Amino acid sequence: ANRMILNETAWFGRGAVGALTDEVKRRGYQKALIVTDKTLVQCGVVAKVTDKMDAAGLAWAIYDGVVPNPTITVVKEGLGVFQNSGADYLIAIGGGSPQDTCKAIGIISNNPEFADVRSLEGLSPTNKPSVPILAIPTTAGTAAEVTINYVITDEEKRRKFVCVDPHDIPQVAFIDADMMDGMPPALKAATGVDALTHAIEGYITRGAWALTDALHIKAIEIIAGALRGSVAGDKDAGEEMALGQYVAGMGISNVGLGLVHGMAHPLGAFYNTPHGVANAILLPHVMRYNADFTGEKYRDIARVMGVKVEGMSLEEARNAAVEAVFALNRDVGIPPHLRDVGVRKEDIPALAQAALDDVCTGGNPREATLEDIVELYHTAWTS
Amino acid sequence: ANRMILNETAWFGRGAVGALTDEVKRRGYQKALIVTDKTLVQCGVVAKVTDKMDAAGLAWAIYDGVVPNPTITVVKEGLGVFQNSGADYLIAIGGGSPQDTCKAIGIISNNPEFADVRSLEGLSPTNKPSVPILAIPTTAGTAAEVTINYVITDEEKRRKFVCVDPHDIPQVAFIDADMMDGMPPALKAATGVDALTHAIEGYITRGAWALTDALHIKAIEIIAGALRGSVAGDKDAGEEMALGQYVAGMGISNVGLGLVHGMAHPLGAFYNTPHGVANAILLPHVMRYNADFTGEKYRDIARVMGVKVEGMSLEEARNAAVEAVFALNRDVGIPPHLRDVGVRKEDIPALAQAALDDVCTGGNPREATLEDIVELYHTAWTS
């Protein structure tokens, strides 16, 4: 049998954060800890929520210490603010980094044996649900609001580790493009291809089945349709991307991903490479590597990405799918090679071993060897 | 903004009820009340769940008094067994009748100000979540396991009233075609066309948006592909219908339905007509009435139902969708006229008024007058 974990409640569309004060009142919560970063405070994005909470008379404290690729230290610091704040629920405002920190704080607060953070790695043996989380994405996006995953950086051991726990699922997600409009174009581009990576890896993952196939192929269609227009500053394209990135996530934790995420995690751990940039550069190379193990699925991908596939052979469709992703990456200004974003040739042996042992790599339709992963990093590194 | 309420957890596939004991243990529940009917006890369908519960040492009591089109008396009987059992959770085993009775019992047990039952009608102003519900459908189906709706018959006032309450959403759904295989072919036919009615009414309802459209057009495609095969006794077609019927309901309470359900409810209240047969007879007549107010959507419906719509005018494709629904009804042996299933001409004025005032009617994409609803009943009445 196949399990699907989703948000019990989700609000979609421009103005969705306007639903938050009535959700809090109906749930009888007394005090929020807002988990976010300094940039979202500075840019007035957090104020779009706190101004509504102030007018409704709802108490909140804030922790804005989250950094990209959030660390054990960031989790322990936010846990300290939660405990000393007396909050009874959490509001995650931001991208994957704040939403992942928020999941870690919520789990540990109701399962305090995990306050070391490291022991959460894998299928966390937690007894209690997380503190209730209201999730508000500001990128489009990681779909952190709908997955049961969170990823923490172990600075000491130079590795990203994945915590997988049904207990961490947010009670409500608010998917509001108003919260996302302030993304610089380069951030729309990188988080957008992260979302496309989730959709493509999900579609072809080993555990794929009828319902996840329907959700993931629709996500690819929405994202391929909207991402260029969103990067160019189009308002409606922004709202499409906000939905597209969510739908892409409805499969990540439920069926899995593959070698793109497996090879991206070690780059974040070694270099603090932005997750979306790493995925975008690797995606088309891993798609080429996987092509022979995906049945007819690359014809579907090609088709919804605007390729005329009618009258192409399977081989021609498979090449057209890979080229369509190369083309998207060029159109939205993603660098084409790993050397361009600060990777070192000398690190590839270590990167490959980390990638081979990453949990995401298990879902890859073609079984990956150390030798194959070394060769793929080399193929992605330079001209 | 658009709200989506879904099951936080769902299990899909033959063997899915195999997940129930581990879900109960992980949630710390002490004692179930099983809400079901005599037929499902008698034919051994309840045993498929209780034998697993017994092997895991889980406590359960049973209420098997549910009747089709469940009444206020049936809710009060089940409520009495729940309150006296000392149960802390509910397991709904059966079609829409036991699942709806279970939601009423769950809501009233934590909200005793509504124990008269009829006060729940509409958007129930409940303060507290239902007693936790684990939902196991045995028809394919009402999607009662994933909606926030339940429908109770007020015998004294001779009306089916719809209750709408986010507090009633089941914690876990177990969608297991093994629990459905025993349906007589005629019950597979009727509940299958109820599922198709949910998907079609959902696709064209006033509140339809991008995410519900994607789910609904997928449900129509799955049901149209599988229903004939399932009625004929095909195992795999039964599994596809189990998924299809569920996907069909992911929109029902999130966006709404229309005049088919609006017109089916009074037949249930007056005659105890099977809900599925009432919907199946009315569906193509209501589709014809609605056609001009559905944009391009009937072309989509016709296409996934197996019609070649390439080169058809919108006018021809709208007729082709209506005719594809008439043909499915003929093929699975649903009677074509309301006279054939116990309706009286003399009652149509009274049925029309009850239909005009039904919750579901408001979602219909064409504005319906009493006079329009009278004419529609007369059209479905006889040749």
Ligand SMILES: NC(=O)C1=CN([C@@H]2O[C@H](COP(=O)(O)OP(=O)(O)OC[C@H]3O[C@@H](n4cnc5c(N)ncnc54)[C@H](O)[C@@H]3O)[C@@H](O)[C@H]2O)C=CC1
């Ligand atoms: N929970 C899960 O299932 C998943 C986890 N992840 C994790 O998510 C992280 C990546 O998060 P991302 O969303 O890509 O970025 P992020 O949360 O790391 O943020 C990147 C930068 O963008 C800024 N930013 C975010 N929203 C902004 C806005 N609206 N306007 C202006 N600046 C804004 C942030 O302040 C930050 O400086 C990684 O740590 C990755 O491991 C990724 C995929 C899925």
Ligand SMILES: NC(=O)C1=CN([C@@H]2O[C@H](COP(=O)(O)OP(=O)(O)OC[C@H]3O[C@@H](n4cnc5c(N)ncnc54)[C@H](O)[C@@H]3O)[C@@H](O)[C@H]2O)C=CC1
């Ligand atoms: N949650 C909601 O608001 C919604 C629920 N409904 C409600 O659902 C009700 C109808 O429920 P249905 O599922 O159509 O049927 P049902 O639950 O009324 O059952 C019909 C008959 O079939 C039998 N049966 C069920 N499963 C069987 C199996 N596997 N093998 C053999 N016999 C089996 C039952 O014991 C019963 O005698 C109506 O009252 C309708 O209003 C309809 C739409 C949505």
Ligand SMILES: [Fe+3]
């Ligand atoms: Fe990702």
Ligand SMILES: [Fe+3]
């Ligand atoms: Fe129905």
